[PDB]
Amino acid sequence: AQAEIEQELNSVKDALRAQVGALAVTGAEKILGASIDANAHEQLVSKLAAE
Amino acid sequence: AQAEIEQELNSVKDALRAQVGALAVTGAEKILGASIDANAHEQLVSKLAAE
Amino acid sequence: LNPSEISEIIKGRIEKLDVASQARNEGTIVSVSDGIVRIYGLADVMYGEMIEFPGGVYGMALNLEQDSVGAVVLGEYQGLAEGMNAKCTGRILEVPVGPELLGRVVDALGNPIDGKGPIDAKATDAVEKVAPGVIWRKSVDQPVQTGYKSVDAMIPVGRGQRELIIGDRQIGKTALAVDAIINQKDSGIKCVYVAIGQKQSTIANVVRKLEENGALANTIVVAASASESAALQYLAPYSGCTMGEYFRDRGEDALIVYDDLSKQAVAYRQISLLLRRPPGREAYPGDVFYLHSRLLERASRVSEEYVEKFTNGAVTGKTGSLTALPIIETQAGDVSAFVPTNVISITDGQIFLESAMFNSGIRPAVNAGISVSRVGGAAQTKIIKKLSGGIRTALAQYRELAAFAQFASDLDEATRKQLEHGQRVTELMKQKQYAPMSIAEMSLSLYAAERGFLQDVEIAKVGSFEQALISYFQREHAALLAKINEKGDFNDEIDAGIKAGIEKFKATQ
Amino acid sequence: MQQLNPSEISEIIKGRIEKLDVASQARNEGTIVSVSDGIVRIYGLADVMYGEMIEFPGGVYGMALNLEQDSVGAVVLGEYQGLAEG
Amino acid sequence: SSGRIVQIIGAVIDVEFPRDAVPSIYEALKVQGVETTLEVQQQLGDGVVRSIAMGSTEGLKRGLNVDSTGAAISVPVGKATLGRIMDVLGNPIDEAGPIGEEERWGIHREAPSYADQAGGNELLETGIKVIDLVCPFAKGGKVGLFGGAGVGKTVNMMELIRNIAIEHSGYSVFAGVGERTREGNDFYHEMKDSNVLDKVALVYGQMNEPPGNRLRVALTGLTMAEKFRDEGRDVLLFIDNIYRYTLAGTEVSALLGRMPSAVGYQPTLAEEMGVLQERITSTKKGSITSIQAVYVPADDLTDPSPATTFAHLDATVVLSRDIASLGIYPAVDPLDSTSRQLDPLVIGQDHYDTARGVQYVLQRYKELKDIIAILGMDELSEADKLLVARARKIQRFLSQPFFVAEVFTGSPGKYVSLKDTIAGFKGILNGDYDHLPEQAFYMVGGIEEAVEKAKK
Amino acid sequence: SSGRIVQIIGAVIDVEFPRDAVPSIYEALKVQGVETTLEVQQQLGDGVVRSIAMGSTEGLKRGLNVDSTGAAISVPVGKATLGRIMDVLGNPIDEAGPIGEEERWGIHREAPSYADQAGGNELLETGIKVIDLVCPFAKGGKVGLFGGAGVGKTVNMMELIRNIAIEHSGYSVFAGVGERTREGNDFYHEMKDSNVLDKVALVYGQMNEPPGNRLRVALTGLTMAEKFRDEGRDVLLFIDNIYRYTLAGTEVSALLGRMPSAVGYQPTLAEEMGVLQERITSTKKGSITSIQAVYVPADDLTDPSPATTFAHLDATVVLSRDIASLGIYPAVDPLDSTSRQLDPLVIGQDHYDTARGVQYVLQRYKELKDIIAILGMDELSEADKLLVARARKIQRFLSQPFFVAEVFTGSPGKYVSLKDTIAGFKGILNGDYDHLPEQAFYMVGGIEEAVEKAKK
Amino acid sequence: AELTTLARPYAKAAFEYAQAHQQLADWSAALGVLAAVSQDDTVRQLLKEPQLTSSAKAQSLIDVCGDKLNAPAQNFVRTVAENKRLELLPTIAEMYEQLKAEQEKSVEVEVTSAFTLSKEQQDKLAKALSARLSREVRLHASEDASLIGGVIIRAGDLVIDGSVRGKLAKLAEALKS
Numbered sequence A, B: 001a002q003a004e005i006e007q008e009l010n011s012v013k014d015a016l017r018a019q020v021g022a023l024a025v026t027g028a029e030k031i032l033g034a035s036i037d038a039n040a041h042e043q044l045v046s047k048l049a050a051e
Numbered sequence C: 001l002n003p004s005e006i007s008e009i010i011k012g013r014i015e016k017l018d019v020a021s022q023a024r025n026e027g028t029i030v031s032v033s034d035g036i037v038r039i040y041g042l043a044d045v046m047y048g049e050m051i052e053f054p055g056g057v058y059g060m061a062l063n064l065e066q067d068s069v070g071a072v073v074l075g076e077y078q079g080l081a082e083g084m085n086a087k088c089t090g091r092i093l094e095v096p097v098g099p100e101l102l103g104r105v106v107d108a109l110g111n112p113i114d115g116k117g118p119i120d121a122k123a124t125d126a127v128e129k130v131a132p133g134v135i136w137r138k139s140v141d142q143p144v145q146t147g148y149k150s151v152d153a154m155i156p157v158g159r160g161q162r163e164l165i166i167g168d169r170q171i172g173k174t175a176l177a178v179d180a181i182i183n184q185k186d187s188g189i190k191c192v193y194v195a196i197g198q199k200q201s202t203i204a205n206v207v208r209k210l211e212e213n214g215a216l217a218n219t220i221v222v223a224a225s226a227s228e229s230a231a232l233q234y235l236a237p238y239s240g241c242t243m244g245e246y247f248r249d250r251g252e253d254a255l256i257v258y259d260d261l262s263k264q265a266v267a268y269r270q271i272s273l274l275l276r277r278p279p280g281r282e283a284y285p286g287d288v289f290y291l292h293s294r295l296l297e298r299a300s301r302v303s304e305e306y307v308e309k310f311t312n313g314a315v316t317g318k319t320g321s322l323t324a325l326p327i328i329e330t331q332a333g334d335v336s337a338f339v340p341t342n343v344i345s346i347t348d349g350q351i352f353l354e355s356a357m358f359n360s361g362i363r364p365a366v367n368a369g370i371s372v373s374r375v376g377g378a379a380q381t382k383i384i385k386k387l388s389g390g391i392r393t394a395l396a397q398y399r400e401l402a403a404f405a406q407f408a409s410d411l412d413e414a415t416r417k418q419l420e421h422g423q424r425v426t427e428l429m430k431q432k433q434y435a436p437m438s439i440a441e442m443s444l445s446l447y448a449a450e451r452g453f454l455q456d457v458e459i460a461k462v463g464s465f466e467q468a469l470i471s472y473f474q475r476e477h478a479a480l481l482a483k484i485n486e487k488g489d490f491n492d493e494i495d496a497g498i499k500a501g502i503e504k505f506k507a508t509q
Numbered sequence D: 001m002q003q004l005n006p007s008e009i010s011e012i013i014k015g016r017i018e019k020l021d022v023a024s025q026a027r028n029e030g031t032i033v034s035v036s037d038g039i040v041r042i043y044g045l046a047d048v049m050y051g052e053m054i055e056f057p058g059g060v061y062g063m064a065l066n067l068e069q070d071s072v073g074a075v076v077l078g079e080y081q082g083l084a085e086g
Numbered sequence E, F: 001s002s003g004r005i006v007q008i009i010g011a012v013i014d015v016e017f018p019r020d021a022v023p024s025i026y027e028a029l030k031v032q033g034v035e036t037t038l039e040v041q042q043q044l045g046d047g048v049v050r051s052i053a054m055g056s057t058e059g060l061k062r063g064l065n066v067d068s069t070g071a072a073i074s075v076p077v078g079k080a081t082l083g084r085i086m087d088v089l090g091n092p093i094d095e096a097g098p099i100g101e102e103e104r105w106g107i108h109r110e111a112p113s114y115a116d117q118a119g120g121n122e123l124l125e126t127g128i129k130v131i132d133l134v135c136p137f138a139k140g141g142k143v144g145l146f147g148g149a150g151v152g153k154t155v156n157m158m159e160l161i162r163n164i165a166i167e168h169s170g171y172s173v174f175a176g177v178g179e180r181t182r183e184g185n186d187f188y189h190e191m192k193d194s195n196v197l198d199k200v201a202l203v204y205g206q207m208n209e210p211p212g213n214r215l216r217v218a219l220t221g222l223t224m225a226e227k228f229r230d231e232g233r234d235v236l237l238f239i240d241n242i243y244r245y246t247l248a249g250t251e252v253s254a255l256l257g258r259m260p261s262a263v264g265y266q267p268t269l270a271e272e273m274g275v276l277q278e279r280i281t282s283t284k285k286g287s288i289t290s291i292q293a294v295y296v297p298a299d300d301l302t303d304p305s306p307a308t309t310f311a312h313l314d315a316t317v318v319l320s321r322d323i324a325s326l327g328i329y330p331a332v333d334p335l336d337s338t339s340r341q342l343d344p345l346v347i348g349q350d351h352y353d354t355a356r357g358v359q360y361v362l363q364r365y366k367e368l369k370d371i372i373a374i375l376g377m378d379e380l381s382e383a384d385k386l387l388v389a390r391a392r393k394i395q396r397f398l399s400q401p402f403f404v405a406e407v408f409t410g411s412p413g414k415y416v417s418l419k420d421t422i423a424g425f426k427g428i429l430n431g432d433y434d435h436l437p438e439q440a441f442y443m444v445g446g447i448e449e450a451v452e453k454a455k456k
Numbered sequence G: 001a002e003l004t005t006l007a008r009p010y011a012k013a014a015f016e017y018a019q020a021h022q023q024l025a026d027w028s029a030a031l032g033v034l035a036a037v038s039q040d041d042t043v044r045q046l047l048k049e050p051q052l053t054s055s056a057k058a059q060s061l062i063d064v065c066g067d068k069l070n071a072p073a074q075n076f077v078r079t080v081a082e083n084k085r086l087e088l089l090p091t092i093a094e095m096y097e098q099l100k101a102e103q104e105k106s107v108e109v110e111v112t113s114a115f116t117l118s119k120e121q122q123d124k125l126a127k128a129l130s131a132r133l134s135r136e137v138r139l140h141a142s143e144d145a146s147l148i149g150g151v152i153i154r155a156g157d158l159v160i161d162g163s164v165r166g167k168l169a170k171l172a173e174a175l176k177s
């Protein structure tokens, strides 16, 4: 089981690496209480590269 | 054995969740720190005055 | 290693964020010393209310002085500093409760420390509560078998009774309470073990022994180890009590062990001296009696009317109970100390463990003269009640007789009969650890002694005779043992059945 | 620094704002400041002697035992529960 | 007028009122919104009063408004209190609805004057061998059951209630002070099932209750007994543990700003005890017969609390842990126990000589016990060997199975009379039973049954 | 920023800092004109912090400037510490130059979690008869040597360091907390001459040192042991005297403004002990076998410090002054000493029954001491006479000449295996040696040497 | 004992005299002058000397203030000095203003935002707070770049947070717990 975790971990790691942006924009939109698409996608492509 | 394999498997999901949650909060902070300006206070200070 | 699942789990916390405004009462930290924090400005804080500090650290309000609030930290305090904001939650200290805690190890606040996942409990309850009043209770008349014949015959424990385990260091106090928890795996009684001020490796060894004996799935383990805040060690018995009370209030039976109330008293003395409250009899707080009396009066048996009222008619015709086994440590046998004096005066009985008997090889080490049960025969099944009547006081008189007749010349038949019988019952009361006996096994052992069958047996052979007799009845009389084990019933048919089996055993093996 | 002395009550402090020399005008008379466990603290009685008897309302009597710098500590020669501040 | 809570520390609460409106000592206060009452212990000055809460402090906050009631804690008194269970503030703690009260009395009162004291010496039979022999009680007197933990105080009080309260035709008051809630439930169902409940007023303040409650429940039960006494009635007053009143004062004393005395007790130990014990008395108007159980910390009779209690009682019954540790019950010590009624001019010379005879034999045996244990029985004189055998038999004939102890003993209960008790002990002293074995006197009521047990 | 000394009282110093720059609890500070280090203990308010000096305070004055370092006391860790001597602050005190450290660790840490604990039961042979019989040790477990002044703790430990290093191949860490400077010099040169020094890390804070040093030296040594455990190694941690860590805390407690507890101890006694003791444990990463000496004040085992230490250990060895007075060394008391490994499921039935047999004989001999003192041995029964004779032989066979004790007398040291230990005591219990004289068992290692000694 | 515990009797006595004689504004000025003057580096030194009597310390403080102290206020300073309480003057002035503000149904509210808010917004917050509290509100508006957006209101011990920083902290605790 430890060998399977060591071999499979990178496959889920690359999936969560893609979802961070969706979680960040939906969370910011909730906090702002108004639509954020017009001021968030240009932030995602410039900041997500550092995560 | 079997129960401990499930014990390790869920602990790994939680170790990842602890890092993804920090990144999602950092993402929301960077997004709001650029998306908020004078056009947001007329939709927030005005909202608080009714609360 | 499932993707998307982790995301939706996170989305579930983002979806339910409290985005609305809140009106709160607040203060500022003034000083941080030895787990104690002083605050200015908390005008609406209630006594014992939870205080919220930066970074999810929590405290509890204990001193509401006219110009300041004295709070104790429910975790590590070294991260707090002067000028930090202190907030107010309109909630009293609460912990999770329910059957989801069975087979889990948790901290004094109910957080899992076993790493076996989240506890999906569906109910929280207050840590500090008042016990059910005089009119809501019911008399104790149901047994709690510990599996030890010396305890179950001479110092019986009933469902809703409070029995103190007391002695010095390293003489079997934890072994007696853990074996009593192990014996409940088939009894239908839920168990709670509270560890106060113990080292974490000792707690892990008790949990390994519960799991190896199959008792962990029926037990809740509450841990407040030696490195944890004195506030968590002070609160742990009340948190464990609250988890046990969940079963009592719903028409079910529970058992709780407090491995060291003397360590809870030392943690309470520390907080009280650091809050600058004036000391008493051994630097202990004035209210150290009320610390233990408020805890121990919750362990009780409640009537059918109380359960019917608590469950809004969902449970009917059933009583509920919480039985307690508190442990106390003495220094060189000194019972005159303030804390031991208080607890012996609160419980429904006590079991005294003696170091001289323990060194002499009597390993359950129960002093029958000093130990006593205030419920007595009402806490025993019909068979054990009849076969054990007068054994405790007969052994107490044998110990005196053995010392009085030690150097005198040969005495009368009445004296020889009492002395020879007391020596055999003394050797019979010896038992090994992790080896409990059923009602039928204890009954055969008691019957062979009180009906005179051991009179021909040598003292050095009593253990071998008992082990062989049990093994023989288990192979040739299995249907009789199964009949005695249904409810512990007794009649002329069972009496004659046991007699015929013991006679055939001694005449042929 | 030091805790409040028995004379440090607002009614006494407010009286020194009206007449600075309010006390010593009637050296034979004082006012009860606190009452507890059979002991009465009084402000005044500047000329009481150690062991002298003090007269209270209702025919109750006490004895002066603590002549402190700021107040007199007296013990009641009967029932104290009827006495009160002021 | 009204005041505001200024400070809360444990069970002690400080409340501030206008200076022209300070509440009196022992005055009752009520918190606004929250269901709690406070008792003024002290007037601190500057309009502030120090009080003890008569309920838990967990909900209380600083700044809550408090109303002055203008009087001390006032409880219902008279016929309406019979067959009811009540708390310290006099509220009903049974599901039987409101009390049919017609009058209320304040719990704080002066003791009867020196001119009002009674003088009766009417002997009261208890049916217990040891007590009727060395500790004869009297109607209208005070009895104390002294003992440590686990020696029989509650059990002996229950046997005395059975042998006196049931047969009596007056009113009774039973006060459970710092008692186990299980004992209170067993006793309530026992009085109810025995049809005795209509004659008894029950007041309960158990160990799960705040220090203010345990500090005042004894005054509530006594206030109900005083109403019956002052009506010209003969009353019975039972107190399961009077030590718990002293302890509640020790628990709160330091928070009330009082410096501690010897053994950590409150400085007011002797006055707080005297103010309570002097009210528990028989007067020219009516009588109070009282039985109090007195806990002895760590079995030490020299502890300040037990030591200050002896002077307040007429009959002092002492229970010994060393006798209980030998299976002997009731575990009473004939040498330490005593009564004001043990006088030939009050009872008679035959009773007195039997009692002193038993005491003489047991006192001499106490020095020989240590001799036999080192040098053996054979080295004693012919008179000493015979005396030791009688002392061990007397020590066993003091035992008796009680009706309330059948659950512990297994055997049935025995009531023994004064004449039967005297005759049995004179027989053992004169040598009429020297031939019977030592085990025949253990747990057997009167002397006849001992002769029968020897044959089994 | 920086602060200013506002108050100095012995080893405790108060420093005032700007409200926006107040240092954290346990943060290290440095005085500008002397470079003396201070550790922050608490924040008092108004920008004032209270600290303990990690050196002498003589010559310091109010108004001196103090610099905050932004972190706790940090010490060097890893391979560079082996064969070197360091002080409480991690500075080298062996004149061999700077430490070639790769990293430094802060001395304050939380204990390993409940899920990180190790369940080891592997037996460790010490070669000492009494310890291997009644106090069996285990690899990765904790041992405590309890004893009053001059009873054998430093000798009985140095014999364990010598014997355990035979089978152990890893590293060791030694922490000298408040003991003799001469013994630290003797131990350093002994290992240097024996070439053992390159596998041991040495830390010292002896009796000559101020309270702050003696209070934190234990943490410095443990921080080095935790680095090696966390690297996946099996290491030995030796603490010269764990009681000195608690005592240094008592000297400073009143200066920290804390109210005293029983017999003058700090109110934080059990917490200060648990915070250190819980870090000294084996985990799933690596193991720490630890041996600690525990001083017993005025020979009182009921004293709060020794009493609080027993619960933190797997094996407890209790040394006695009464045993040392008879000539027996090591002066261990079999009836007071115990171990978690003394279980039939861990050591097997043969060892377990031999150990239980020895304890039964010694317990029965202890009960006869007063009778034997007044009347002599000749009055005992034929069974008691035989048992007393075997008890005297067992008590003498427990003695053993050590390889570190050779200087005191002249006799050569002995190493006895577990097999030889069990065989000797089993034979004495069975009666196989009833004919040999009592003095033949005194100071002889294995049982066969008692047979050769009896020939003289 | 806190300084507030020791200053309470004196602040209350000064307030009740000032209220009964209609001198609330005179005592407000007098206590403010004494609080400031007693904190001066030369006066602070003079008040701590061990050789001066209580009356000498009181007279020196009265001579320095002069014109600002009426006969009652001079009598109050001589009373504070006789009881050896001159160190409490700054706390006595602070507690007197709290009794005055509560009597005059007045509340001073501190307000902080990420960036400046208009007079229209301040007057909207002021009417809302005055309607909730039933008191006259004095908004001490200010800015703090630590806030990502929105505003925080501090009406004494009561705090109302509508800022974005508070919401981000709630999310961090929700995910970390």
Ligand SMILES: Nc1ncnc2c1ncn2[C@@H]1O[C@H](COP(=O)(O)OP(=O)(O)OP(=O)(O)O)[C@@H](O)[C@H]1O
Pocket (backbone or CB within 6 Å): C168, C169, C170, C171, C172, C173, C174, C175, C176, C329, C363, C364, C431, C432, C433, F311, F339, F340, F342, F343
């Ligand atoms: N019935 C028994 N038969 C044999 N040995 C026993 C028996 N009961 C307990 N022991 C042993 O004696 C010791 C008792 O240890 P235990 O932890 O239970 O005592 P304790 O009083 O709780 O000690 P401590 O003060 O450290 O907590 C253990 O070695 C245990 O295995």
Ligand SMILES: Nc1ncnc2c1ncn2[C@@H]1O[C@H](COP(=O)(O)OP(=O)(O)O)[C@@H](O)[C@H]1O
Pocket (backbone or CB within 6 Å): C372, C373, C374, C375, C376, E147, E148, E149, E150, E151, E152, E153, E154, E155, E156, E329, E330, E331, E402, E405, E408, E409
């Ligand atoms: N007379 C008695 N006969 C039998 N057991 C008794 C007797 N008195 C006390 N006991 C025992 O002691 C307990 C009850 O005594 P109790 O009255 O509660 O003592 P105490 O009030 O001194 O604590 C029970 O365990 C019971 O077995």
Ligand SMILES: Nc1ncnc2c1ncn2[C@@H]1O[C@H](COP(=O)(O)OP(=O)(O)O)[C@@H](O)[C@H]1O
Pocket (backbone or CB within 6 Å): F147, F148, F149, F150, F151, F152, F153, F154, F155, F156, F241, F293, F295, F329, F405, F408
């Ligand atoms: N055989 C022996 N003969 C004399 N002294 C011995 C012997 N074996 C051990 N010792 C004593 O052992 C002591 C070791 O330290 P000890 O005094 O017990 O601990 P501590 O100094 O740390 O309190 C030495 O002081 C020494 O006197």
Ligand SMILES: [Mg+2]
Pocket (backbone or CB within 6 Å): C173, C174, C175
């Ligand atoms: Mg234990």
Ligand SMILES: [Mg+2]
Pocket (backbone or CB within 6 Å): E153, E154, E155
């Ligand atoms: Mg009782």
Ligand SMILES: [Mg+2]
Pocket (backbone or CB within 6 Å): F153, F154
């Ligand atoms: Mg030494």
